[PDB]
Amino acid sequence: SLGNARPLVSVYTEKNEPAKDKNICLPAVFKAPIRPDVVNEVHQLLRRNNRQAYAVSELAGHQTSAESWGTGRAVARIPRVRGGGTHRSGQGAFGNMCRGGRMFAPTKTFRRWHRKVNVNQRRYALVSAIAASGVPALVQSKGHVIDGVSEFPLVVSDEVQKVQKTKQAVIFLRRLKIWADIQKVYKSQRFRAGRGTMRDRRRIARRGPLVVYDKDEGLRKAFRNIPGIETINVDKLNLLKLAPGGHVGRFVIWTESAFARLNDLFGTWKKPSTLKKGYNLPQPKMANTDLSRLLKSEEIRKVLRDPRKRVFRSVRRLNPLTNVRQLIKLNPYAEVLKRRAALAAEKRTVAKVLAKAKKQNVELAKSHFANVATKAAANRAKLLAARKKKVA
Amino acid sequence: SKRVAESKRRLKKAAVIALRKKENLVRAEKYQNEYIKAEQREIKLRRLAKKRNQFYVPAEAKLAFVVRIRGINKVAPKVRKVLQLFRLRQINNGVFIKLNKATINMLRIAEPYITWGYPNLKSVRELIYKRGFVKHNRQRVPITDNFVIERKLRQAHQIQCVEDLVHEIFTVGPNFKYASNFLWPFKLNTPTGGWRKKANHYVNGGDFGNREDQINRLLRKMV
Amino acid sequence: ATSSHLNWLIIRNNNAFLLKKRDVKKPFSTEPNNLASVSSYRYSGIVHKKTLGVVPAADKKGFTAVLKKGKYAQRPAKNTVRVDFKAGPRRSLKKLKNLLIGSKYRKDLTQAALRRASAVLRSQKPAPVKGKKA
RNA sequence: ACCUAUACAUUACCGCUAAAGUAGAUGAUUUAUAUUACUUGUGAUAUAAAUUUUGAAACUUUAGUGAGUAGGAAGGUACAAU
RNA sequence: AGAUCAAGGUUAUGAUAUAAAUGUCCCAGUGGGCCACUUUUGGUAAGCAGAACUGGCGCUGUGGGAUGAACCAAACGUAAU
RNA sequence: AAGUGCUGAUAGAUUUAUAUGAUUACAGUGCGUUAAUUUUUCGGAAUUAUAUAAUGGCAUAAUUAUCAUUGAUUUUUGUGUUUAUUAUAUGCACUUGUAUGAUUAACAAUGCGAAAGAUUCAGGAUACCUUCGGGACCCGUCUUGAAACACGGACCAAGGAGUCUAACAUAUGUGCAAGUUAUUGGGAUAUAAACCUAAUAGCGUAAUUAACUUGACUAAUAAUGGGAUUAGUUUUUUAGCUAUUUAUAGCUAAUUAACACAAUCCCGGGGCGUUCUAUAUAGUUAUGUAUAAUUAUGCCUCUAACUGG
RNA sequence: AGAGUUAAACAGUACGUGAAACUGCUUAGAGGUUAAGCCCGAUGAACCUGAAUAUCCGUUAUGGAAAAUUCAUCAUUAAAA
């Protein structure tokens, strides 16, 4: 929508120089969508074109003359070698199970080694790489020591293209605080763990920055022998440089006249491009893309219904036939029938211990007459019934 | 302005929980006095019809209790289907069944894998109190209180208490179909003391088919 | 463009600091601004200026120099470098944790940051102790 | 009476399957207390202390459930290279 | 035989719903079967030959029948009771 | 059938409930009317009215409906009646109290992670040896069925078998969209890469005939036009629900109307083909014809074109 | 067999590593049953792994020292956010 949105990119020069009067505007590729899923899928494929053929000799296997010395000779049935006298006899020819014999399907030259990616999909893989070469969260997650740099995307003046001796390049990469990255590329010069070490790849290190110049006055020769850094020209812009491995966001350095051309290559949000015929910058599926302000939000939290705030687990089934406390929770009336028959069974044992007052007549001291003495005070309920129940 | 709202919720959820407990007391009191006037009437009718020398038949039984008794293999595709529809798919599962001509001819079909009989009130109670579970969107929720019957069945039937389940099942009510399909089938366990043959009829050996009063005495040792 | 959720789903798995270790289901970032060192979404190098951490010291033992986030004066397109500010409390082993709650109020890392400065101040101490047993 | 299965049952654990919940943390929540509007009474404000990220590809809750050749699908795992 | 109006009560046996409905890949394998109740044909009979139904074995362990592909119980995540 | 009144034993006891959500509703204890009654006297003890619909009991009215009907059973109740029964009328504090958050915790004993130094208690079929009990046939394969008196295998290390390609088809990912696709080439050029790019060319955009013919809805508009079954957005009024200023929302629907996506199910309509049929045809436009001079205009129409169901 | 050489001869011409198959010797325990192996429960011997500090009816009552302070009721001042 915008093309502006952070619309002032300061330019720096050789003495780390914040101050110009030249402040150019952010060239609107940098809002276009970062998509590492398409960048990885263009990278997977496009670097299959620097790739030449391996293939085994198509006569390996088959210049014996072995016929299957065939059943019934107590020995199995492979083609065995004919001769006698050379001790390669009979000895097993032609099969992949055999020593000497031809491999399962031998590798040919007309395997598809190279590939064609669609050319908009290259441009919508370069665009996501350029757009992620700003955004220093995604440079810093390639390693890339960038916490000395003073801007993103870092733009140096055009004068650095005239530099000519490499001593005056590590003077330059010192002053812009990016020497500490190419000092990290010195740290990881190692040896490979292959088979590389026999086959002429005895290592890389990691990558470093990428000086995107516009006109090599002497720049490319001046930055050759620094290990880690590599430069590029704005017209070319290889993707396999700007996202090494499928992984967006190499630490990049624009010069001034490099940076001022990106509003032509991939044109702008307003108009198409002039240097790429008919190209039109890709539109994201989600323009605002900040969820924590989308969910914040007061345009949405006047709709939301149910923030169910308990958990409600609390589960265990008790037993309402041994745990009495569940009976009175579940069938509350059944509490009554407990206090009715157990009260009525109380007076039964009261009556049957008074059957011993038929027999031995002992007490009745503080134990069982006191169980029945309350009836005499309970007589007053019937004695009030003759005087207080005659009020209505 | 939230704390004003919740403590009016919290004190109207209290008054409704209080107005269930008394309304589930005097409703269990009314339901209990039915089961005293009922069985005392059938004493009164016999001690009547003896002196008038008539024969008092009692009522034929509605409400069976049907329990799969035997085995999940070697079963034929028409006893395989009746016993699916009776929800009896394991050994020693039991469901409540309303008896008419239309399920009795289905208990006839599934007869050698089923023992059944007509249950006591004590048997109806002890099966939903000790073993009794409940369907909350296919989940088998236990009982744990009588909110969990008040939830799904008070708004569209008038069952809210646990004794309203027992009343809708002992007296086979209009909401019977709702309150047997509410209860997940009773996963009883194996009777202590045992079975007798499991695969000769109750009149010959003792299991499958109508026990018809002795589902109560079996369920004593099964629940 | 730039938001901590778009930035994170690019970084969620293909990171350079995330270094998951072998059984433990996907955690550990070795970031310089993590302070509860897993990889969450909001314990992270750049989550865009909720980026607090707790570093010692430089002078052990007294300090914990705290890199406080260098915030919304920055995009954080870089700064004529600012964006780590390093206000470092000192001099009292359990007063400064009140002076860190007192300092910041960015209530998402807050109890997981003074949970870390304690666990630095637990660690830098033990020089004149763990000695004699005579 | 009693003994006896990998069956039945109640529990712990593993998976599966099916549902359900959580993301305003310059927020939420406690405990006290100062003040307070005061509505009797309960809230709102200040103070002091306290708890409050999760590869949201996560975490939390709940229930059922588990035979398998030929065979198919998912998720891991060993080897070597870019 | 239809196209729009008017009237219609409480939706019209029972019990069930481990979700059902539908495309594509007609994708893999298979296209030698054997056993058994009851029915049955050829044969004198057969652990023979050939069919109808249901269930099994094949693919399936465990308990029982001393023993066993199919019998009788029972179907199988690791454990206690 | 009731708890009737218990007494014995057994095994078991998830839980980082904020390592992103009640420990609170319950009930239970300890302070603040009354009065006699009783009992022990050291407590307790008992007592009414205190407000119910009253539910059960009695009498009676009343009606729904019935086994059998002298009657009984009810049903709706209603009144009176007293006999009982039950619930509600316990705030404020305060407990180490009970419950409920898959209800295990209180008491003791034993023993010190013990500076290096070093014991106690539990556990360890790790991978074996010793001692017993139980179970226990040899794998791979074909087969209806293998421990098979079926085939291969004495043993061990290395090797060893579902691949590249071509062309389709479906599914999924991605880019652009009536389009798309550099890649045969060319250009720039940093190097068999990447970039840029003119004319085509494929495939799609329109089909059907053996072929020649012909070539897609009444219309400046229309998703199988129309019809059903439609998810969903708008909309209707109604009580109505939370908030209400009683404004404005959310809710069910009752229910009005509208468009009805997708998908399937029915009925059409067009293109082309084939066939019947209308034309008896008049007639529709021009050559011709009428004239002037291919030309101008008349108009009949021998001629071709054209209309029709 | 001593000695010597080397960093090393456990690198001495099978000359780097030096696996399995199979085995001479030492040590340990044991031996008449499925031929041996093996599963599961335990076992003797042997070796081994793990083990704990702020409370009942509280991170409460209360006295000693040390050091020191953007802390106070502190106050100004200087910043950087």
Swiss-Prot record, chain A:
Q: Recorded GO terms, molecular function? A: RNA binding; structural constituent of ribosome
Keyword Ribosomal protein recorded: yes
| A biological-process GO annotation | cytoplasmic translation
Q: Determine if ATP-binding is one of this entry's keywords.
A: no
Q: List the taxonomic lineage.
A: Eukaryota, Metazoa, Ecdysozoa, Arthropoda, Hexapoda
Pfam families to which the protein is assigned, alphabetical:
Ribos_L4_asso_C, Ribosomal_L4
Kindly provide the name given to this protein in its UniProt entry: Large ribosomal subunit protein uL4
- Keywords carried by this UniProt record: Ribonucleoprotein, Ribosomal protein
GO CC, one annotated term: cytosolic ribosome
Disulfide pattern: none
| Similarity field | Belongs to the universal ribosomal protein uL4 family.
State the InterPro entries in the record: Ribos_uL4_C_dom, Ribosomal_uL4, Ribosomal_uL4_dom_sf, Ribosomal_uL4_euk/arc_CS, Ribosomal_uL4_euk/arch
From Swiss-Prot, chain B:
Gene Ontology CC entries for this record: cytosolic large ribosomal subunit; cytosolic ribosome
Q: Which PANTHER family match?
A: 60S RIBOSOMAL PROTEIN L7 (PTHR11524), LARGE RIBOSOMAL SUBUNIT PROTEIN UL30 (PTHR11524:SF16)
Protein name from the UniProt record = Large ribosomal subunit protein uL30
One GO-annotated biological process of the protein: pupariation
Q: Which NCBIfam families match?
A: uL30_euk (TIGR01310)
Which molecular function term from Gene Ontology is one that the record holds? Answer: structural constituent of ribosome
What the record says about family reads:
Belongs to the universal ribosomal protein uL30 family.
The gene is RpL7
- In terms of superkingdom, the source organism counts as Eukaryota
Q: What does the UniProt keyword field contain?
A: Ribonucleoprotein, Ribosomal protein, RNA-binding
Cited function: Binds to G-rich structures in 28S rRNA and in mRNAs. Plays a regulatory role in the translation apparatus; inhibits cell-free translation of mRNAs.
The regions listed as transmembrane in this protein's record are none
Swiss-Prot record, chain C:
Q: Where is this region: Disordered?
A: 121-134
Among the Pfam families in the record, one is Ribosomal_L28e
* Gene that produces this protein: RpL28
A GO molecular function term, named singly, is: structural constituent of ribosome
- GO BP, one example? cytoplasmic translation
Cellular component aspect of the GO annotation: cytosolic large ribosomal subunit; cytosolic ribosome
Q: Which UniProt keywords apply?
A: Ribonucleoprotein, Ribosomal protein
- Specify whether Ribosomal protein is a keyword of the entry: yes
What organism does the record attribute this protein to?
A: Drosophila melanogaster
Membership in a protein family: Belongs to the eukaryotic ribosomal protein eL28 family.
Q: Know the name of this protein? A: Large ribosomal subunit protein eL28
Reading the lineage from the top rank, the first entry is Eukaryota
